[PDB]
């Protein structure tokens, strides 16, 4: 069940080209990076950092990645924000992942416009498919449908494996 989110230098068209496809549709696919910065120093990096991003995997778990970057605990609150707000912690220019996952058939295509606090970042694409096969028995052939509909100006970034793994994979684009 290989993951394969792709960043793109040619946005906008996802809202436009995918509906232009003659095929079927499903629901929402939006998620949100949220950079953090402790109001004082000390807690600066690593295990005890300014760094933090609760990660809004809105689509399924509804559970934030309560993660100070590579610090693995997860929770819905939110209430934890206020807990973190004890005369503490700020933000930084995170870029949210939001969109448009749709039913297709043997495979299905998650879609999301990506948004820096500076408004825009650049659309990501994903296609879930059966996992019994080895990584590339058909993944490039799946990418034939990344060329159908044709997709352009893709970034080289390649997160790789259900979808809970995408959480760590967010970092793969977050660390960029």
């Amino acid at each position: 069940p290989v993951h394969g989110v792709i960043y793109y230098s040619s946005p906008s068209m996802a809202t436009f080209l995918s509906p232009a496809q003659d095929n079927l549709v499903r629901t929402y696919f939006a998620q949100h990076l949220k950079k953090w910065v402790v109001q004082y120093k000390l807690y600066r990096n690593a295990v005890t950092p300014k760094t933090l991003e609760f990660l809004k995997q809105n689509i399924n778990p509804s559970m934030l990645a309560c993660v100070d970057e590579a610090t693995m605990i997860d929770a819905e609150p939110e209430l934890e924000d206020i807990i973190v707000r004890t005369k503490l912690w700020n933000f930084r220019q995170s870029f949210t992942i939001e969109g448009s996952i749709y039913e297709v058939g043997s495979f299905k295509v998650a879609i999301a416009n990506v948004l820096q606090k500076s408004v825009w970042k650049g659309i990501l694409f994903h296609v879930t498919y059966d996992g019994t096969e080895s990584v590339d028995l058909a993944r490039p052939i799946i990418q034939e449908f990344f060329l159908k509909c044709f997709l352009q100006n893709n970034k080289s970034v390649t997160p790789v494996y259900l979808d809970s793994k995408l959480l760590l994979q967010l970092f793969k684009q977050r660390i960029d």
Partner: protein
Amino acid sequence: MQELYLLGVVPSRRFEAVVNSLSKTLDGPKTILEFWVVYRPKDVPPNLPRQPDSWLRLCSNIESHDETDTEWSKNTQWSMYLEGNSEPKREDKCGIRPVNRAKLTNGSVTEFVEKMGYEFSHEYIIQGLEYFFFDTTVRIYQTLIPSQQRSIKPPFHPMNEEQPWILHVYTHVADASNQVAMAKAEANLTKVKTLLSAFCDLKNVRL
């Protein structure tokens, strides 16, 4: 989460007799068993929030867990609390303390508060009884000090084994902005106070 509450000691000699005046007429009994760690965020600079609530309180409910089973410390359910303090000028009135009822899901559990670097401090275990009235509930207390740090094995350490039963009616408001649940739940639990007054004398205590 604005908890509203009171306090009233029950000597153990009259305790279960009170329970007869309670559980027969109420939901429960439910024995409580939850291992605390009230970690203190020793931090710089002043003015620190420094208040007892400001110190963190990871809250591992374990009541169904074995008294000797080893997986507990980061597999059995945990929680966390800072909570706001009960209201100023809350004389005799049930104390109103907003609460962040944290929850968590990973093999890592405690670690994040030390990922926040927070130091260990005092610890105990809620171990009393609780009796429902819808969203409201009474929570009579038992808070034995654990036999060793991160040790779930009894006997534990009440300040006296002639332990006071710190009876404690309560409720949990979602948000304090409306007058509704204020006077409403205060009335219902004041009537609950009338019920306990048939066998006890609860009071507010500053927090």
